[PDB]
Design a protein around this ligand. Sequence first.
Ligand code: WW2
Ligand code: WW2
Ligand code: WW2
Lengths: 453, 499, 485
Amino acid sequence: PVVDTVHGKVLGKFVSLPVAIFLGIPFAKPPLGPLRFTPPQPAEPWSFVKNATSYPPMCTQDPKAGQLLSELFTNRKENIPLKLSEDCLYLNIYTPADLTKKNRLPVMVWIHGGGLMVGAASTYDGLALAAHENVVVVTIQYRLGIWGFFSTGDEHSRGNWGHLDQVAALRWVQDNIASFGGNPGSVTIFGESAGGESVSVLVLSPLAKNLFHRAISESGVALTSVLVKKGDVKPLAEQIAITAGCKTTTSAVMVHCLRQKTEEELLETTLKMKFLLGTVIDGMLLLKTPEELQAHTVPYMVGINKQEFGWLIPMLIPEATEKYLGGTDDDLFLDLIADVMFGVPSVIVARNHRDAGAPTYMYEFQYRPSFVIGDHGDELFSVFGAPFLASEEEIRLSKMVMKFWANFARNGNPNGEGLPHWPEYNQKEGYLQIGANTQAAQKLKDKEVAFWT
Amino acid sequence: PVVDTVHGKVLGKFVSLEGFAQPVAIFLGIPFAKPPLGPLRFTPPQPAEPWSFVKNATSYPPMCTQDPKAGQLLSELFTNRKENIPLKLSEDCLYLNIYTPADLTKKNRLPVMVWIHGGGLMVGAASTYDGLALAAHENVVVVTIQYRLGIWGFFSTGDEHSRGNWGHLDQVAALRWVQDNIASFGGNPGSVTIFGESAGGESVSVLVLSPLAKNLFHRAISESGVALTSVLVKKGDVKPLAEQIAITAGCKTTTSAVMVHCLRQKTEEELLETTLKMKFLSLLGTVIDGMLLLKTPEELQFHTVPYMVGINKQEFGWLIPMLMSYPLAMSLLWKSYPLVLIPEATEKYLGGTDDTVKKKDLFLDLIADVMFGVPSVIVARNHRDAGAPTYMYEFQYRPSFSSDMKPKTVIGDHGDELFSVFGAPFLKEGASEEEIRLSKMVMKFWANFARNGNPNGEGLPHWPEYNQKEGYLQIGANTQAAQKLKDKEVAFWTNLFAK
Amino acid sequence: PVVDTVHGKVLGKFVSLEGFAQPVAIFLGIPFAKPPLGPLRFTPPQPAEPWSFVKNATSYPPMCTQDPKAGQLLSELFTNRKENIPLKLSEDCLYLNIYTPADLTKKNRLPVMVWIHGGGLMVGAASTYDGLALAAHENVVVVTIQYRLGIWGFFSTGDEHSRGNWGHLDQVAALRWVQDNIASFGGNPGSVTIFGESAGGESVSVLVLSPLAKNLFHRAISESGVALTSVLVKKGDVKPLAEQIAITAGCKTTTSAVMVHCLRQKTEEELLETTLKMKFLGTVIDGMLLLKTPEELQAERTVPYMVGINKQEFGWLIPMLMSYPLQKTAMSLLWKSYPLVCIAKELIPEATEKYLGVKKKDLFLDLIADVMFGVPSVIVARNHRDAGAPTYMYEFFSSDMKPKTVIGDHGDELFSVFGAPFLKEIRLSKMVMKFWANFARNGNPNGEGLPHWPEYNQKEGYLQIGANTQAAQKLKDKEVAFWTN
Ligand SMILES: *[P@@](C)(=O)OC1CCCCC1
Ligand SMILES: *[P@@](C)(=O)OC1CCCCC1
Ligand SMILES: *[P@@](C)(=O)OC1CCCCC1
């Protein structure tokens, strides 16, 4: 299959579950040399046909931690080994459309997670979802760690370099997606963990206006303080510069020095830092804090998993400790951490969104995939049809979820034939409990919110 | 205090000067250009990137890379603050400081006085000069700007690969930042005066001759230094100086373009060691680039704006000779070639006296006249002759804030007028009531001129205009008019140099 | 002499050639582009920054980075000056030299002949060739241009991160500088002829096939070298060559963009050591300069074109430089010569046999000769002739080490074209210069006092230049047939 984009022709391959898969398409200019720590640039056009049949590179991050996460979230039988590089602003496309005719299938752009430190788009295979629910799946990449989030707190390096790629990727879709059978007028963004935090931010950013029409934050929102550095970040910048062997005489000086370091050097700095940097109020992408901003009204689904701090994350005061551990002398602490990190934040968000006047849907995933219940990221295997790349029970669960996510992708409403009714998160605070028994329920984490608030 | 500029908001601080109801708003370190780092080195200044939110402007900016010892020494000798301020060194130095007496909570169009420090185009910093006193006393907005120095601001290849005058272009860029933003600090962009001393006067002189500075200012004051002061203006083929610098720095000199690329990769620290090896200021500069200056200052002799031009009684009395590590006639005179027939001259200034002690002072007067005396007047005359207002002065006074090592017989030494202009008697301690008054007088003159293009006003001895009567002012303990300054010497020097 | 160009004034010098009243004005080292340094490396040429006052261009410009030994050796063997000139090496080399016989104190529209040196797209310099003689004798403006070589002018990744042909783009940029400025030197921008030998002919051939060179010239002369000479045109996936070069230089090959960024940071000295280690890149189908292969382009169809070769192309010069190892053995070497003839291992016997079935050694040299220049040149001349444009064919101070039995060796025609007999036979040169010059003005070599030079039409009439310059027919006809089969 050969599609014709704005920057040139790209050659893909057919895969039958047939679908046309285009791996590694550049949506920006390689952020190398002096382009580092700067907004993404449009991509230079190419003559002839661009062969897009091999996976693009993860983006520079810890190679061990990244390969481990890829291995734990991937919905492919065999995990794929990625290369590391600063040249990583690529996206993958999975289209079920029959390119030999016009097609306006809805579009679902996925934003991977990884604490804004690790991850890759190639981890998630959208062959299943595309084929099953007849939508165009796009997995994008953005800069991570130092490379995509270094900030000085001033005009010499505002920050959010990573969030700007996400926007640039979204804009590449508006201008080119129709050539793959997708309707640029019906675009949905969704991601989990740091990926949900990103979906949440783009919904709050003026720059992302008109680039999408629906959103899905899976286990993660903007209020999840961990990923949003509020206050003076200058001190974090100065430490990073020092650890890397730079002077901190001034901001401008710190950035110039860092632009000369080699990728390998900046990775050793990253390693020394022993993380595991983040979204900041830069003045361009975010003008005020997520809180102040909650003081685009597009359909927004927000969900969490039963046990967020059950195993995956942990593995990789008195009043509170008491409030969760008092009633038993004999997991409750893991529920504490869970509620503070996703539980409470998610609902307070869903409520504000609901209150600003836009459609809102909540869900609580609860199921132990075959590939602790409702652990971090467990919903991922259902959304991406892992059971097709499994007890007959699981196969069905995936089918149900994909249909929900897909329906929403086209109507801004998850409901449809053969699917338990999913109430809208209105005043009745009606949400969905997804699992072996998917039934409606009400007032999710209500009590805790009150407590923590 | 929070002012709103074109590039964003800046936050300053209020400072009250003894005996004044309206405190002053001080904004330290405001960027008027983009940090000339990396590939921006040896290139014109770029506009400054705008910033979101409010920019805290409450700490002194750093100083353009220069010799840290020599710079801190000069800062200590010219500073009008009680305590001298220790500066950091950096290529990121294109900043300016603002001192405004205006009450920002209302409209204000106070005249503006932009100061251009001196330092032989090799050392110096804006933070040395505190404009709290002048601003408060004469009700004007004082601005102290910075520009690139030494290699960083004057390296030239003599061709389009590095014309030069990078430093003089920042001065223009700083002047343009004022036009576009000064009104937000209570200043009238329509009444801007530039003034500086030594290399700073040489700069004021150049800007008055440069087509690029047209409309950026309306008055000028050159304190002890003009464009004709050959020492700072490299005339002729500069290519050889460029090649030496490149070599000393470990670069090939295959071509111009190659020399500049090589130099752009050197680290600031390396270029400073090159500077140090060069041993300048011990016994690079404005060049005719084609953009800032199209022909020599002589050939050019321009904006007919008012100009004051003055010198000090003993320019070579102690400060300069000392710093350069002067060896203290025909022998030295010749050895002084990089700063300034010999027998005729040595004779003309040392003949009438056998006393070799006196004869020594007479040699210092020679160097003085050649470096400032004669040049200044020949300039004032041309300016006068092109049809614009011209005022001359000769400062003569030994400030109390002078150095301990400075012989007491020295009066009107290099830069001595600085303490009067910047109200040193109101920031430092222990000033005879005589000095306090001298400062008051000078500030009122400099300020009056800053608004009318005429120094005169109530309670001030009459300052004649430098017309055909060559009337000038003698500033000191007894400030009275006099005539035909250095007339005789000019004639002499103008002649010996003829052949 | 002071001429006034678009980017500023340039100052030259007058030089008189023995027996001429009008001395010539020589302008050495004029920039036609911006020094391709730093981030400008591996990118198209940029216009040149304008200078103020008067530029002092009276000294030879540097030579594009290349092997200093091999380059100085070639300069010494082709140069038409009494004494050879020592050049400096630099990436800052996008310059041109001008030799004008015109009397600048009046209007003049003399034809223009732009020379493109050879050197396998690896070595060479414009300063090697002195155009004082040709200019003065045939009254034309001679221009010797320079372009990037080796890695610097031909590195390619096969994609939009470094298409390639950086060197061929300078040639175009040089040609465009002539259009905009040549008239200030007494030249008519409407009558421009390009000519070069070896890799220089290959370049002239490419510019004639490139849409970008349209309207920049009106005549062409390829001396011993055309586009079909496969050795200089990398067809197919070049990515592997790029990855090797990056590795040899100490770069990662994670992606194309990454290879180019890495290489842009290497110092000129480093990239030269990489070049040296390689122990030798070339014209590629980039999509900008060349859209399809030279073959495909000649399938589809027009300025006059002269195409010629020399009697013994592989007689001494090339075999020597490459350090050549000199019926059974023939097939051995032939195969080992794959990077120069790209002949299939199976075919070899047929060929080795066809030419060899001491003397046999000369016959092998004729083989290599025919495959490299002979056959290619004619197949070209024919296509050009068949597309409907004028076509002319021809068959044309040596080294002490050069065996005396060698005649019409590689580049031997150079001394005639550039009037070597007037700086360091005398008649031969005169004849050639008049031909090359006539063509430069009419698109026809013929004129008074010159043996008739037939046009390469269906009669395949060509010229045999030498001690006895007479017409002949069907050049290399038989061989073409053989090889084509
Ligand atoms: P999301 C799955 O990206 O959050 C991460 C942060 C690093 C530790 C594990 C969870
Ligand atoms: P002017 C003070 O700028 O020139 C001289 C002053 C004394 C040190 C050397 C430069
Ligand atoms: P042609 C003159 O372009 O190629 C030559 C270069 C020197 C070695 C043999 C081939």
